[PDB]
Design a protein around this ligand. Structure first.
Ligand SMILES: [Mg+2]
Ligand SMILES: [Mg+2]
Ligand SMILES: [Mg+2]
Ligand SMILES: [Mg+2]
Ligand SMILES: [Mg+2]
Ligand SMILES: [Mg+2]
Ligand SMILES: [Mg+2]
Ligand SMILES: [Mg+2]
Ligand SMILES: [Mg+2]
Ligand SMILES: [Mg+2]
Ligand SMILES: [Mg+2]
Ligand SMILES: [Mg+2]
Ligand SMILES: [Mg+2]
Ligand SMILES: [Mg+2]
Ligand SMILES: [Mg+2]
Ligand SMILES: [Mg+2]
Ligand SMILES: [Mg+2]
Ligand SMILES: [Mg+2]
Ligand SMILES: [Mg+2]
Ligand SMILES: [Mg+2]
Ligand SMILES: [Mg+2]
Ligand SMILES: [Mg+2]
Ligand SMILES: [Mg+2]
Ligand SMILES: [Mg+2]
Ligand SMILES: [Mg+2]
Ligand SMILES: [Mg+2]
Ligand SMILES: [Mg+2]
Ligand SMILES: [Mg+2]
Ligand SMILES: [Mg+2]
Ligand SMILES: [Mg+2]
Ligand SMILES: [Mg+2]
Ligand SMILES: [Mg+2]
Ligand SMILES: [Mg+2]
Ligand SMILES: [Mg+2]
Ligand SMILES: [Mg+2]
Ligand SMILES: [Mg+2]
Ligand SMILES: [Mg+2]
Ligand SMILES: [Mg+2]
Ligand SMILES: [Mg+2]
Ligand SMILES: [Mg+2]
Ligand SMILES: [Mg+2]
Ligand SMILES: [Mg+2]
Ligand SMILES: [Mg+2]
Ligand SMILES: [Mg+2]
Ligand SMILES: [Mg+2]
Ligand SMILES: [Mg+2]
Ligand SMILES: [Mg+2]
Ligand SMILES: [Mg+2]
Ligand SMILES: [Mg+2]
Ligand SMILES: [Mg+2]
Ligand SMILES: [Mg+2]
Ligand SMILES: [Mg+2]
Ligand SMILES: [Mg+2]
Ligand SMILES: [Mg+2]
Ligand SMILES: [Mg+2]
Ligand SMILES: [Mg+2]
Ligand SMILES: [Mg+2]
Ligand SMILES: [Mg+2]
Ligand SMILES: [Mg+2]
Ligand SMILES: [Mg+2]
Ligand SMILES: [Mg+2]
Ligand SMILES: [Mg+2]
Ligand SMILES: [Mg+2]
Ligand SMILES: [Mg+2]
Ligand SMILES: [Mg+2]
Ligand SMILES: [Mg+2]
Ligand SMILES: [Mg+2]
Ligand SMILES: [Mg+2]
Ligand SMILES: [Mg+2]
Ligand SMILES: [Mg+2]
Ligand SMILES: [Mg+2]
Ligand SMILES: [Mg+2]
Ligand SMILES: [Mg+2]
Ligand SMILES: [Mg+2]
Ligand SMILES: [Mg+2]
Ligand SMILES: [Mg+2]
Ligand SMILES: [Mg+2]
Ligand SMILES: [Mg+2]
Ligand SMILES: [Mg+2]
Ligand SMILES: [Mg+2]
Ligand SMILES: [Mg+2]
Ligand SMILES: [Mg+2]
Ligand SMILES: [Mg+2]
Ligand SMILES: [Mg+2]
Ligand SMILES: [Mg+2]
Ligand SMILES: [Mg+2]
Ligand SMILES: [Mg+2]
Ligand SMILES: [Mg+2]
Ligand SMILES: [Mg+2]
Ligand SMILES: [Mg+2]
Ligand SMILES: [Mg+2]
Ligand SMILES: [Mg+2]
Ligand SMILES: [Mg+2]
Ligand SMILES: [Mg+2]
Ligand SMILES: [Mg+2]
Ligand SMILES: [Mg+2]
Ligand SMILES: [Mg+2]
Ligand SMILES: [Mg+2]
Ligand SMILES: [Mg+2]
Ligand SMILES: [Mg+2]
Ligand SMILES: [Mg+2]
Ligand SMILES: [Mg+2]
Ligand SMILES: [Mg+2]
Ligand SMILES: [Mg+2]
Ligand SMILES: [Mg+2]
Ligand SMILES: [Mg+2]
Ligand SMILES: [Mg+2]
Ligand SMILES: [Mg+2]
Ligand SMILES: [Mg+2]
Ligand SMILES: [Mg+2]
Ligand SMILES: [Mg+2]
Ligand SMILES: [Mg+2]
Ligand SMILES: [Mg+2]
Ligand SMILES: [Mg+2]
Ligand SMILES: [Mg+2]
Ligand SMILES: [Mg+2]
Ligand SMILES: [Mg+2]
Ligand SMILES: [Mg+2]
Ligand SMILES: [Mg+2]
Ligand SMILES: [Mg+2]
Ligand SMILES: [Mg+2]
Ligand SMILES: [Mg+2]
Ligand SMILES: [Mg+2]
Ligand SMILES: [Mg+2]
Ligand SMILES: [Mg+2]
Ligand SMILES: [Mg+2]
Ligand SMILES: [Mg+2]
Ligand SMILES: [Mg+2]
Ligand SMILES: [Mg+2]
Ligand SMILES: [Mg+2]
Ligand SMILES: [Mg+2]
Ligand SMILES: [Mg+2]
Ligand SMILES: [Mg+2]
Ligand SMILES: [Mg+2]
Ligand SMILES: [Mg+2]
Ligand SMILES: [Mg+2]
Ligand SMILES: [Mg+2]
Ligand SMILES: [Mg+2]
Ligand SMILES: [Mg+2]
Ligand SMILES: [Mg+2]
Ligand SMILES: [Mg+2]
Ligand SMILES: [Mg+2]
Ligand SMILES: [Mg+2]
Ligand SMILES: [Mg+2]
Ligand SMILES: [Mg+2]
Ligand SMILES: [Mg+2]
Ligand SMILES: [Mg+2]
Ligand SMILES: [Mg+2]
Ligand SMILES: [Mg+2]
Ligand SMILES: [Mg+2]
Ligand SMILES: [Mg+2]
Ligand SMILES: [Mg+2]
Ligand SMILES: [Mg+2]
Ligand SMILES: [Mg+2]
Ligand SMILES: [Mg+2]
Ligand SMILES: [Mg+2]
Ligand SMILES: [Mg+2]
Ligand SMILES: [Mg+2]
Ligand SMILES: [Mg+2]
Ligand SMILES: [Mg+2]
Ligand SMILES: [Mg+2]
Ligand SMILES: [Mg+2]
Ligand SMILES: [Mg+2]
Ligand SMILES: [Mg+2]
Ligand SMILES: [Mg+2]
Ligand SMILES: [Mg+2]
Ligand SMILES: [Mg+2]
Ligand SMILES: [Mg+2]
Ligand SMILES: [Mg+2]
Ligand SMILES: [Mg+2]
Ligand SMILES: [Mg+2]
Ligand SMILES: [Mg+2]
Ligand SMILES: [Mg+2]
Ligand SMILES: [Mg+2]
Ligand SMILES: [Mg+2]
Ligand SMILES: [Mg+2]
Ligand SMILES: [Mg+2]
Ligand SMILES: [Mg+2]
Ligand SMILES: [Mg+2]
Ligand SMILES: [Mg+2]
Ligand SMILES: [Mg+2]
Ligand SMILES: [Mg+2]
Ligand SMILES: [Mg+2]
Ligand SMILES: [Mg+2]
Ligand SMILES: [Mg+2]
Ligand SMILES: [Mg+2]
Ligand SMILES: [Mg+2]
Ligand SMILES: [Mg+2]
Ligand SMILES: [Mg+2]
Ligand SMILES: [Mg+2]
Ligand SMILES: [Mg+2]
Ligand SMILES: [Mg+2]
Ligand SMILES: [Mg+2]
Ligand SMILES: [Mg+2]
Ligand SMILES: [Mg+2]
Ligand SMILES: [Mg+2]
Ligand SMILES: [Mg+2]
Ligand SMILES: [Mg+2]
Ligand SMILES: [Mg+2]
Ligand SMILES: [Mg+2]
Ligand SMILES: [Mg+2]
Ligand SMILES: [Mg+2]
Ligand SMILES: [Mg+2]
Ligand SMILES: [Mg+2]
Ligand SMILES: [Mg+2]
Ligand SMILES: [Mg+2]
Ligand SMILES: [Mg+2]
Ligand SMILES: [Mg+2]
Ligand SMILES: [Mg+2]
Ligand SMILES: [Mg+2]
Ligand SMILES: [Mg+2]
Ligand SMILES: [Mg+2]
Ligand SMILES: [Mg+2]
Ligand SMILES: [Mg+2]
Ligand SMILES: [Mg+2]
Ligand SMILES: [Mg+2]
Ligand SMILES: [Mg+2]
Ligand SMILES: [Mg+2]
Ligand SMILES: [Mg+2]
Ligand SMILES: [Mg+2]
Ligand SMILES: [Mg+2]
Ligand SMILES: [Mg+2]
Ligand SMILES: [Mg+2]
Ligand SMILES: [Mg+2]
Ligand SMILES: [Mg+2]
Ligand SMILES: [Zn+2]
Lengths: 64, 49, 14, 149, 107
RNA sequence: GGGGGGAACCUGGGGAACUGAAACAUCUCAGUACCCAGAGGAGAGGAAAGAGAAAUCGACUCCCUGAGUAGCGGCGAGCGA
RNA sequence: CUGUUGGGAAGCAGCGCCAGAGAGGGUGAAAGCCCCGUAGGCGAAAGGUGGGGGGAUAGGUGAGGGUACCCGAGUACCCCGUGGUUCGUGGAGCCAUGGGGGAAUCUGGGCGGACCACCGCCUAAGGCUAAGUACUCCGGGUGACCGAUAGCGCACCAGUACCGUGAGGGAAAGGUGAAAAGAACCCCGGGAGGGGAGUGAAAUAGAGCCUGAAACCGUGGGCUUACAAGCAGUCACGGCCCCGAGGGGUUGUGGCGUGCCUAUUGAAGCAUGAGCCGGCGACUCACGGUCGUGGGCGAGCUUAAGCCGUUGAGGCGGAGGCGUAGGGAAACCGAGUCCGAACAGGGCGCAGCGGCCGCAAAGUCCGCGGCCGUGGACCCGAAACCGGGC
RNA sequence: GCUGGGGCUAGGAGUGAAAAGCUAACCGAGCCCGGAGAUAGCUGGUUCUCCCCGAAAUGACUUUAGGGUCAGCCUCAGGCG
RNA sequence: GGAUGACCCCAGGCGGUAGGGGAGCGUUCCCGAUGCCGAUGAAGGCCGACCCGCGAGGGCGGCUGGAGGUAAGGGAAGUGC
RNA sequence: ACCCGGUGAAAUUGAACUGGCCGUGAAGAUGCGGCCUACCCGUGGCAGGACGAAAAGACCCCGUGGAGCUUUACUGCAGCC
């Protein structure tokens, strides 16, 4: 039958107009008191996934 | 479209018979020459417009 | 042959 | 042109890759599968899009973000699809959302908004919304924006 | 329901093919289950017979072999030719076989 | 009048496990397999105490589409209007 | 219809003819015209049907004004326990209801995802209703379906023989020939079998029957071998036999030489499988995806289910899908947008070749190929777990 | 005490002077048919020919260690030069 | 070189397991086919020291066999032990 | 048991034209090397080898395989309060 969108992927990731895959930084869910402002600031930003891993995630989102 | 004329020619081994509504390319290519009503030529002129 | 004679037991190699 | 003349172009009808049919084929015995893995077996591996050998997968270590939703699901609000002026360069007279659905421009069930990219033409354009740029361009080119509802 | 026999016992038929093509003879017998007929004087064969009552001295006797009923064509008792059988109805309402060449009846 | 039978099909009452989750328990398999009762040439359903936002539609069944959408989910595997 | 080869004509030859019929199967080989059929027509006393045409019956039918009489009860409704829904306790409604409590009759009541208000929708607690839908024991039609190890387990006296206490398991086995003309009679023999005779176009087509492969067994002939060391071959030369400046068969001597497959760092290996032969035997299909590719169209491309037509004819159908705009959790903004106080900075975004026409192309549709996902998903193999039976 | 005939008790069940004995010639959970083509990261096997190229047995992570994901190393198409 | 396999010349590459890629052969079936090969002998079988092809194969001839077979060009697979 | 007459199996079996020593070899060779020995084929006997046959090693390990059994392992259910 037709494929199903993986819902972990859709809920974590976004495919950009040229086909890149972008995700929130990791590291600021907790244990943040002793972390630099530079570290909390830099991780507030999105980041492009490495190409081998992005092309895997894209196969999980066949209807975007 | 002449039912009488198709009935006359259906049995000739060298004749495929056809109504204009059924003009296909397999039967055209299957055969060496083509013969059409001017009524049916109008029908072919519509279907490729 | 629906009856198979059971195999002899192996020499104990312990 | 007779039936002995009907021919596919070169490359239209490639042959298939029959495996496990002999030494000469280059594909015999192991059927191009190599030796003795889970991947060699009928049923192969888990989904190689996700499975990473038992470790936490690269996808599941990334955090989620945003509103995912909750029962009873999507909230019905008006949806807005945009159309740039350059797209309108083909029409004369009046533009309406109804007129643009048939052009293959504005999908059904979407409110029409005109956008700036392009060049305004002296048209009557009826639409649910206009950007600041498209509005400005349109007045200047003699066209009449008509904000409907 | 029934096997269709263009020919019947007793009428004269021509054998149109085989070794005996050209022969003419009365239909001695019709075997519907085998789609065949026995024609007088046609298709003779040699049957060995054991020494027995009704056959002392033994040896061989000549019997007539069957012909596929398709190799037989009735000879029109009027015009005298072989013909296919038509079906003509009568004023009685009944239906008889009739010659195709001329219009005669064959019964 | 009933009783019993009928290859699949149908409705109701009950209702697994292997398996999948590369372990497993919630979850999956699946209201499937199967047991039972009933029905008929079909069975079910059916004429709004409906839908759900159109200041709308207008019984029910079925097909296409909506849509792998909305959602659901040890937010896992998956499930899925 | 005739002639001709032939056991046999339908083959071949000469001259015709039909065709609303040149689908197909037979007939001694290959037939429009020999047979059965086919096109096109016709047909029911009796039984079944009859959804269509007709008739009949049951049945159906207005206002204003007043009155507030009735409008489905252990029900609604609330709570407890659960089920159904995409909804797994979740903000958890709706629908159902096992337990407790327990109303009203339209100023009644339920619903629109806790709740409340407003605005609306609908009238629970009785029942019935064709069609469009599913299936295939049964009849028929048609196959880029099988052709006797295949196709149903069964082409055949098969759910049999046989196996099992039983539930249950479950086979193998088709073909003489055109016609039995199925071989009188004689000879050897107890018979079986054979040898003659005879039939047949053909009898190593003789019923233990079409074709008749291979393993395997044997008779006859050529070459060869009893001082020789071997994965059996190969290279060379010589001898002998055969076929007719060459070739084939055989092998005496000399040289060289560690089976096949599998698994392995590594096998001739004293590691695995195989007695030998014949047949069966393992990477596919569907739908989705992702590249590549042959075409069509191109800011567009494309239809699904259905409807009409055909009876191996194609057409219609634009519902919908992909694409034409991105950015943001979103409100929203938009060639920009988000973070930010910012006009800061950054993240993700945005912009053909020829001479108005031609070639091209975003895209998209179809075909094809490779690979992926869901399915048993390359084939064979457990020990086990569950259900109902015996 | 031994024995004939007639009966009853069975599958997580029976019966057992107890051996996990026996329950139709293999019982630490009978037999059949079914779920079913369970699942098998394991072993085996995988069939015509020619041509070009041609690896790896490492690193990281892994209830991972004889299995995998990514990189490394091979091959094909297109582009650069 | 000639002008885009139309053949020739010169030079270089051409061991190969896992594996990537290319080009071919053969099997069954469909169109081609109301055709054409066929009893003056179909397919199948048995020989061959002969012809073509690198090969897989294909011819041709003789014996057997006795009624089918099927081209150039394409199409689809239960396709080679 | 042996010989003659009658009837006549089996497991096993890559093929076999199947010698010794000292070496060599995946580490225990009829099969490789160098020597030595040896005319061809049996019958009755013996078991040292063919890592002889039989049984896809019970031991041992491995498998995120199974099953029985235990308990102050986890989590439930019957039962009982
Ligand atoms: Mg998730
Ligand atoms: Mg996102
Ligand atoms: Mg936080
Ligand atoms: Mg610090
Ligand atoms: Mg700081
Ligand atoms: Mg800080
Ligand atoms: Mg910040
Ligand atoms: Mg979509
Ligand atoms: Mg015709
Ligand atoms: Mg015709
Ligand atoms: Mg024709
Ligand atoms: Mg056995
Ligand atoms: Mg044994
Ligand atoms: Mg193909
Ligand atoms: Mg290929
Ligand atoms: Mg092939
Ligand atoms: Mg091969
Ligand atoms: Mg290879
Ligand atoms: Mg593969
Ligand atoms: Mg393998
Ligand atoms: Mg290996
Ligand atoms: Mg390997
Ligand atoms: Mg292997
Ligand atoms: Mg390995
Ligand atoms: Mg592998
Ligand atoms: Mg891999
Ligand atoms: Mg393999
Ligand atoms: Mg399997
Ligand atoms: Mg597997
Ligand atoms: Mg771990
Ligand atoms: Mg979160
Ligand atoms: Mg969303
Ligand atoms: Mg009468
Ligand atoms: Mg009944
Ligand atoms: Mg039910
Ligand atoms: Mg139960
Ligand atoms: Mg389970
Ligand atoms: Mg399963
Ligand atoms: Mg389990
Ligand atoms: Mg599991
Ligand atoms: Mg698992
Ligand atoms: Mg487990
Ligand atoms: Mg369920
Ligand atoms: Mg049920
Ligand atoms: Mg009943
Ligand atoms: Mg019906
Ligand atoms: Mg009904
Ligand atoms: Mg009802
Ligand atoms: Mg009502
Ligand atoms: Mg949970
Ligand atoms: Mg699920
Ligand atoms: Mg479910
Ligand atoms: Mg003659
Ligand atoms: Mg004639
Ligand atoms: Mg002629
Ligand atoms: Mg016809
Ligand atoms: Mg015909
Ligand atoms: Mg015919
Ligand atoms: Mg002919
Ligand atoms: Mg023929
Ligand atoms: Mg005919
Ligand atoms: Mg008719
Ligand atoms: Mg008729
Ligand atoms: Mg009242
Ligand atoms: Mg009421
Ligand atoms: Mg629930
Ligand atoms: Mg619930
Ligand atoms: Mg929740
Ligand atoms: Mg709920
Ligand atoms: Mg309520
Ligand atoms: Mg309720
Ligand atoms: Mg209740
Ligand atoms: Mg409740
Ligand atoms: Mg009210
Ligand atoms: Mg009220
Ligand atoms: Mg209610
Ligand atoms: Mg409410
Ligand atoms: Mg409502
Ligand atoms: Mg409502
Ligand atoms: Mg009612
Ligand atoms: Mg009903
Ligand atoms: Mg109905
Ligand atoms: Mg039928
Ligand atoms: Mg039938
Ligand atoms: Mg056939
Ligand atoms: Mg057979
Ligand atoms: Mg059979
Ligand atoms: Mg046969
Ligand atoms: Mg076979
Ligand atoms: Mg077969
Ligand atoms: Mg059979
Ligand atoms: Mg049958
Ligand atoms: Mg029998
Ligand atoms: Mg029986
Ligand atoms: Mg018995
Ligand atoms: Mg019995
Ligand atoms: Mg016969
Ligand atoms: Mg016969
Ligand atoms: Mg004959
Ligand atoms: Mg007979
Ligand atoms: Mg005598
Ligand atoms: Mg005799
Ligand atoms: Mg004799
Ligand atoms: Mg005799
Ligand atoms: Mg002859
Ligand atoms: Mg012969
Ligand atoms: Mg013969
Ligand atoms: Mg025959
Ligand atoms: Mg024979
Ligand atoms: Mg024989
Ligand atoms: Mg023979
Ligand atoms: Mg001899
Ligand atoms: Mg000597
Ligand atoms: Mg000598
Ligand atoms: Mg040697
Ligand atoms: Mg020499
Ligand atoms: Mg010579
Ligand atoms: Mg020689
Ligand atoms: Mg030699
Ligand atoms: Mg080999
Ligand atoms: Mg091994
Ligand atoms: Mg080993
Ligand atoms: Mg050896
Ligand atoms: Mg060996
Ligand atoms: Mg050996
Ligand atoms: Mg061993
Ligand atoms: Mg091994
Ligand atoms: Mg092996
Ligand atoms: Mg054996
Ligand atoms: Mg042998
Ligand atoms: Mg074989
Ligand atoms: Mg494949
Ligand atoms: Mg398939
Ligand atoms: Mg594809
Ligand atoms: Mg494509
Ligand atoms: Mg197109
Ligand atoms: Mg173009
Ligand atoms: Mg279109
Ligand atoms: Mg802000
Ligand atoms: Mg910016
Ligand atoms: Mg930028
Ligand atoms: Mg294209
Ligand atoms: Mg792939
Ligand atoms: Mg499946
Ligand atoms: Mg499969
Ligand atoms: Mg696959
Ligand atoms: Mg068992
Ligand atoms: Mg369980
Ligand atoms: Mg059970
Ligand atoms: Mg039970
Ligand atoms: Mg007693
Ligand atoms: Mg007693
Ligand atoms: Mg008793
Ligand atoms: Mg008892
Ligand atoms: Mg009992
Ligand atoms: Mg019982
Ligand atoms: Mg049990
Ligand atoms: Mg159990
Ligand atoms: Mg017990
Ligand atoms: Mg006792
Ligand atoms: Mg038993
Ligand atoms: Mg026992
Ligand atoms: Mg057990
Ligand atoms: Mg037992
Ligand atoms: Mg059963
Ligand atoms: Mg299952
Ligand atoms: Mg399976
Ligand atoms: Mg398992
Ligand atoms: Mg190389
Ligand atoms: Mg390593
Ligand atoms: Mg493993
Ligand atoms: Mg890799
Ligand atoms: Mg490199
Ligand atoms: Mg690459
Ligand atoms: Mg090269
Ligand atoms: Mg090479
Ligand atoms: Mg081929
Ligand atoms: Mg074609
Ligand atoms: Mg044809
Ligand atoms: Mg001819
Ligand atoms: Mg002849
Ligand atoms: Mg001949
Ligand atoms: Mg052939
Ligand atoms: Mg054939
Ligand atoms: Mg040949
Ligand atoms: Mg031949
Ligand atoms: Mg024929
Ligand atoms: Mg053909
Ligand atoms: Mg071809
Ligand atoms: Mg196959
Ligand atoms: Mg003696
Ligand atoms: Mg003896
Ligand atoms: Mg005897
Ligand atoms: Mg034996
Ligand atoms: Mg050998
Ligand atoms: Mg040898
Ligand atoms: Mg020797
Ligand atoms: Mg050593
Ligand atoms: Mg050494
Ligand atoms: Mg040694
Ligand atoms: Mg030796
Ligand atoms: Mg050797
Ligand atoms: Mg050597
Ligand atoms: Mg030696
Ligand atoms: Mg030596
Ligand atoms: Mg010596
Ligand atoms: Mg001896
Ligand atoms: Mg010994
Ligand atoms: Mg020994
Ligand atoms: Mg020994
Ligand atoms: Mg041994
Ligand atoms: Mg052994
Ligand atoms: Mg095994
Ligand atoms: Mg083992
Ligand atoms: Mg064992
Ligand atoms: Mg033991
Ligand atoms: Mg060990
Ligand atoms: Mg173990
Ligand atoms: Mg573990
Ligand atoms: Mg593991
Ligand atoms: Mg375990
Ligand atoms: Mg257990
Ligand atoms: Mg158990
Ligand atoms: Mg258990
Ligand atoms: Mg107690
Ligand atoms: Zn006449």
């Amino acid at each position: 039958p037709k494929m199903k969108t993986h819902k972990g992927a859709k809920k974590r990731v976004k495919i950009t107009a040229s086909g890149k895959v972008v995700a929130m930084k990791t590291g600021k869910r907790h244990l943040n008191w002793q972390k630099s402002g530079k570290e909390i600031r830099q991780k507030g930003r999105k980041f492009v996934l490495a190409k081998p891993e992005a092309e895997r995630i894209k196969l999980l989102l066949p209807y975007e | 479209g002449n039912e009488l004329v198709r009935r006359a020619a259906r049995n000739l081994p060298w004749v495929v018979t056809l109504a204009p509504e059924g003009l296909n390319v397999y039967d055209i290519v299957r055969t060496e020459r083509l013969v059409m009503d001017l009524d049916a030529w109008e029908v072919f002129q519509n279907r490729i417009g | 042959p629906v009856y198979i004679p059971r195999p002899r037991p192996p020499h104990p190699r312990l | 042109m007779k039936l002995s003349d009907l021919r596919p172009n070169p490359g239209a009808n490639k042959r298939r890759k029959r495996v496990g049919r002999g030494p000469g084929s280059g594909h015999g015995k192991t059927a191009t599968r190599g030796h003795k893995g889970q991947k060699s077996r009928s049923g192969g591996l888990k989904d190689p899009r996700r499975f990473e050998g038992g470790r936490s997968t690269t996808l599941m270590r990334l955090p989620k973000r945003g509103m995912q939703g909750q029962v009873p699901g999507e909230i019905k609000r008006p949806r807005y699809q945009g159309v740039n002026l350059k797209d309108l360069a083909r029409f004369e007279g009046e533009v309406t959302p109804e007129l643009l659905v048939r052009a293959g421009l504005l999908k059904k069930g979407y409110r029409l908004k005109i956008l700036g990219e392009g060049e305004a033409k002296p048209l009557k354009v009826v639409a649910h919304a206009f950007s600041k740029s498209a509005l400005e361009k349109l007045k200047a080119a003699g066209g009449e924006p008509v904000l409907l509802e | 329901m029934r096997v269709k026999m263009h020919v019947k016992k007793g009428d004269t038929v021509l054998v149109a093919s085989g070794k005996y093509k050209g022969r003419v003879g009365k239909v001695k017998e019709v075997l519907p289950k085998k789609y065949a007929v026995i024609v007088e004087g046609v298709n003779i064969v040699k049957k060995a017979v054991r020494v027995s009552p009704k056959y002392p001295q033994g040896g061989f006797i000549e019997k007539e072999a069957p012909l596929h009923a398709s190799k037989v064509r009735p000879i029109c008792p009027a015009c005298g030719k072989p013909t296919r059988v038509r079906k003509k109805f009568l004023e009685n309402g009944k239906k008889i076989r009739v010659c195709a060449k001329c219009g005669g009846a064959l019964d």
